[PDB]
RNA sequence: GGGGCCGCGGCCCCGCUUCGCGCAGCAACGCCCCCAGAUGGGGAGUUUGGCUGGGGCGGCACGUCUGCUAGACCCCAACGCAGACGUCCUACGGUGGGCUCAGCGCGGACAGAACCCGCGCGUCGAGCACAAGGGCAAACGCCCGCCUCACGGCGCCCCCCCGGGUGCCGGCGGGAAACCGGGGCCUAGCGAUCCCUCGCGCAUGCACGCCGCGUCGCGGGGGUGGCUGAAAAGUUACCACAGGGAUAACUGGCUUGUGGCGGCCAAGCGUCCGCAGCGACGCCGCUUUUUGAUUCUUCGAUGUCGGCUCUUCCUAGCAUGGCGUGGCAGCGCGCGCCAAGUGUUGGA
RNA sequence: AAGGUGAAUUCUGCCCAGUGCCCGGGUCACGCCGGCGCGACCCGCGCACGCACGGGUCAACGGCGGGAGUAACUAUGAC
RNA sequence: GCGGCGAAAGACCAAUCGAACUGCCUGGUAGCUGGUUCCCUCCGAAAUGUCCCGCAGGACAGCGGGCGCCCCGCAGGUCUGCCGCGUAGAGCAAUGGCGCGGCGUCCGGCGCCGGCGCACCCCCAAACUGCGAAGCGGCAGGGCGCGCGCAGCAGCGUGCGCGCGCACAACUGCGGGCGCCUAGUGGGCCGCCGCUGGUAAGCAGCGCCGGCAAUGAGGACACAACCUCGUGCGCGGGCAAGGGACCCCAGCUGCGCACACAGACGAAGGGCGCGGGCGCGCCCGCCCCGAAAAUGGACGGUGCUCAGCGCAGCCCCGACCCCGCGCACGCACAGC
RNA sequence: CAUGUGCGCAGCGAGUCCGCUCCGCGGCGCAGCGAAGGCCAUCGAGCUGCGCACAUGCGACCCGAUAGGCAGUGAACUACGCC
């Protein structure tokens, strides 16, 4: 039968007893950064306090 | 739906009775000439001949 | 229920009452064969060609 | 349904389903060690069980494993000493089927019913056998005993010379 | 619409831009053995009646344009999916 | 229809009898049996959607898109308003360059309202497939050249999808280049599992090989418009059941469009004369005696029309009582007032 | 045996397009056959009832239309 | 018995017939109706979203409860700052309408009339906007500074590692974050303000907030929603809303006004009715006419003409509210 | 009752589980990924029982259809036919 379609009311009510919560704080992910800065970023990590040369120098050709 | 009553009268038991019949009436099968002689003319049941 | 002709609020067929020679028993019912129909007015030659 | 579960498997639409309750079994093993006790009162002296070959297990799941066999193939009984026949009317179970694979299995079962034959003590008939005071044996006659494998040890020096 | 004959397109097989020459898909006949018509059929021998539903209801008087194009290099082949149409020409 | 149903002869045809059969006959056919078509409401099952100011009929805020409703974030309902989509396009796509459109003005043989050309102006009033909105002037429009980014492989975002955005590595096109391009200026133009089909696979036949005889993975496609996707015609007044006052058919209630009744204004009519009496065009009310509207009460039932019978009540007064007024001489008639006591019939 | 109409009297008109029934002469299933194969297969062909096509039949189911002008007033419309 | 039998009514077939009776399958299935059994204590909803042959039902999400774990600062708020909106208003300036005049080296017809043009102007717009509020929305108010390494990115930066140094950032309040399992709910209704459809409706459909549902008690004559205001069991105080002639707790002092069985439902239109005010006409109060329904009857009643309509002063009454105390129960327990 | 899941409790713990039996190298776990060929960790506490809540199958909280089927019984009422 007929009967009521929509409302919203109750619903900021509902939505504030358990409050609005925030976005959870997470670890920083690489979803959706660039893909040439990301690796590059990645390089950077991979060699931090040893250099590139270095690296390959001891590990030959790294790719 | 029920049974038609065409096909409910195809039942045996809707034939007309035998003891209504006289006999059987067949030329009689005969090697020579039989000579009879009428003895009675007689009505059947349902039979107007 | 009882006929196949059986039918409602006006007493009328419905179908063609021309059945097939190759119907069901259940449906052989009114004209189970019929070469023609309606009122003959002819010799038999001319119908039966 | 409602929650997050693992789908419900449960076969209990048929209700031909019938259900076989075990509160027979502190009975059925009364009763089954009662059998086995007066199956020994019947044939004092012999055992009660068979003599059975050590088999090795089908699969390569198990074939690390020997068990113990149904019978011994009668080339094994002959390569004893024995007829077959003559090896089922003293304890030794006779397996027509199985086929001699190889000489490993072959000689251990050979050995296995030569080790039997010399264990055993013949009497003349049932009375003097039953009066002989003689212990007989329960249990399977020559298991295969489980243990655990032993770690083989070899020296290091010796490691290229085993396996280069 | 109308497609060309021929198109330079990336080559997956070549790595290259080849020409290509390009033709309308059709779809095949169902064949005999599919693991699919062979459950079907079985399931439709006895006295089981239509095993199987059978769309009655149609909506769609498009097909969307699939193009085949074959390498002049390679001959290798591979598809491209256009848009629905009614009607396509090529040349 | 074909096959099986074990027979002889002769030319599919004709004899035959010894099979078979409903058996003095037919006849190696057919009965019968086995497959396969055709027919088959005679019968068997089953189906015949939803939304809905009851249901039906009708129509689809049943999937998608635009403007509004919408009350200045967004979101926001109605069988709300105004519409649209299911296609179309090898160009109407990509890009580079050049250009400027609608319209107006003023000139020019035939030449006219309307042929073409020129000059001047021209903020977008044109065009951009289409609905609408947004967008756009050395362009997002027009014209021309070269093209096919309407591409493969990996991601990510907006996010049910649909569609779109954004990256990376390749492959390209246009351009001197910067750049631009991952179809259509942007917002619609589309579709699960299973199945089929095609392309691709550095897959595969679980004792081992081979034979596309198959099976898989990945990506397309074939489709469910009732658009998160059964495979589906009716009738029942012979109907049954579970229910529903979630919901119609009486009364009641709210409302009063319609019905009924009453006011206000005064154009005009009424011999002259707006108002003796009327009274248009308009406007304001009242009533619940009409009919709707709605669906609040009732569907484990409130007996549904009319009449007969019998009682009572209201006044918006028909008669009877008293009056006022008249375009009331009388007789009569009209208009108005007070009053609900008593009355208000017999018939076709 | 199957139907319809329902005594008599007087009658029972027109329609075979549709549907049905009946009659007559391209398409189609299995098997067969043929191609192919190492085999499974796969590929083809032939065809009966039917459909189709042609015909009959309404005391079979049933059906049985419009628009314009037009006479000695007008009206009507024989035409 | 999906059978019979029927001069046909779906009639009859053992008080049963549009498919009899018996036993069984069978405790058939039911998204539907009914019912669902002790107490106290602690907390306490939803009637919404998406999808569904979905619309009397579900599943997911939301909300409830229970169980946890973790020390990360938390907020239905204000302030400060920057962006966003396009409603009310406003505007005819573009789009789209409306309407008359005015003007004219414009056109037509016979100076006039009609067209057209222009400028002013008029009435306008949910699907118009040169403007644009009130009101809202987003975000920020803490880490910074320096140095050194790294990169295949880049072409001269950007990120990322590491170290040293500096340092606690408007107001107010205050513990907070997260996880797990599960119920009920998915017919709502009402008020306020803002709306849509509709002549309207105790009608239908929305937005925001509050309520009822599930919220007692006081006041409303009674009365789910109004007003006050929350609510253990008592005692004492003070009050709220609302009242203070009698029902019925609580009233007196003064100043006005009104006479109509008024106050006690109402319109247009009226009234040398009364009281004030302004320039005979207006204006403001009260009253009157307009003002008619059916059981006898309702400011709640009695009644009231200072119990009506207004005001002022002081006072009073009145809830489980607030305050204080005591007790019970709960808590993480000098308390709440 | 079966099978799950979550929580609590319990024993042992890279293990764990007596109860089929006269004696589990049976299950799950110590590590996963892929359709597969193939790849194999940078890596992780589980097993079993007890109890409750909940999901599902079962008569499934209790009671309830109209129906459908299978097997039977009736023409002493009544319908028709025959003797
Ligand atoms: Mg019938
Ligand atoms: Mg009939
Ligand atoms: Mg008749
Ligand atoms: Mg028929
Ligand atoms: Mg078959
Ligand atoms: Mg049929
Ligand atoms: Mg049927
Ligand atoms: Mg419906
Ligand atoms: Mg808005
Ligand atoms: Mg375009
Ligand atoms: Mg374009
Ligand atoms: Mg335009
Ligand atoms: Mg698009
Ligand atoms: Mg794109
Ligand atoms: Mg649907
Ligand atoms: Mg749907
Ligand atoms: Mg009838
Ligand atoms: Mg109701
Ligand atoms: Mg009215
Ligand atoms: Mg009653
Ligand atoms: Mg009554
Ligand atoms: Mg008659
Ligand atoms: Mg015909
Ligand atoms: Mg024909
Ligand atoms: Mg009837
Ligand atoms: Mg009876
Ligand atoms: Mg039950
Ligand atoms: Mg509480
Ligand atoms: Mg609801
Ligand atoms: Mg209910
Ligand atoms: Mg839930
Ligand atoms: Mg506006
Ligand atoms: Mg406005
Ligand atoms: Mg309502
Ligand atoms: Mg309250
Ligand atoms: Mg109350
Ligand atoms: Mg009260
Ligand atoms: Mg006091
Ligand atoms: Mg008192
Ligand atoms: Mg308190
Ligand atoms: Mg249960
Ligand atoms: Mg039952
Ligand atoms: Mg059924
Ligand atoms: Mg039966
Ligand atoms: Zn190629």
Known sequence: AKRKNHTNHNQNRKNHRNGIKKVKKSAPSFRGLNHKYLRNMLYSRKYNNIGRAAYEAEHGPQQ | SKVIRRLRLLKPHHRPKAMWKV??????????????????????????? | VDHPHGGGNKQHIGHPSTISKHAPPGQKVGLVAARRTGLRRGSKKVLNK | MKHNNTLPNNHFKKTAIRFKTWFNQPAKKEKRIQLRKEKAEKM??????????????????????????????????????????????????????????????????????????????????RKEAKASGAAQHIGKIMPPKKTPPVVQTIKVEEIAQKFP | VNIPDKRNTHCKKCNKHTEH??????????????????????????????????????????????????????????????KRTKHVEFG
């Open chain 4, 44 to 125: 004092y002296p012999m055992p009660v069980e068979k003599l059975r070959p050590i088999v090795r297990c089908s699969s390569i799941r198990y074939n690390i494993k020997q068990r113990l066999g149904r019978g011994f193939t009668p080339e094994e009984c002959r390569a004893a000493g024995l007829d077959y026949n003559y090896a089922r009317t003293i304890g030794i179970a006779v397996d027509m089927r199985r086929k001699n694979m190889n000489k490993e299995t072959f000689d251990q079962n050979v050995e296995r019913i030569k080790v039997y034959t010399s264990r055993l003590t013949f009497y003349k008939d």
């Open chain 5, 21 to 82: 020459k390009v033709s309308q898909y059709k779809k095949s006949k169902e064949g005999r053995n599919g693991q699919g018509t062979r459950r079907y059929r079985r399931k439709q021998r006895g006295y089981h009646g239509q095993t199987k539903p059978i769309l009655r209801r149609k909506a769609k008087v498009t097909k969307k344009l699939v193009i085949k194009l074959r390498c002049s290099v390679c001959d290798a082949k591979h598809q491209q999916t256009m």
């Open chain 2, 23 to 49: 006999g059987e009436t067949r030329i009689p099968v005969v090697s020579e000439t039989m000579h009879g002689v009428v003895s009675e003319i007689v009505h059947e049941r349902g039979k107007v001949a």
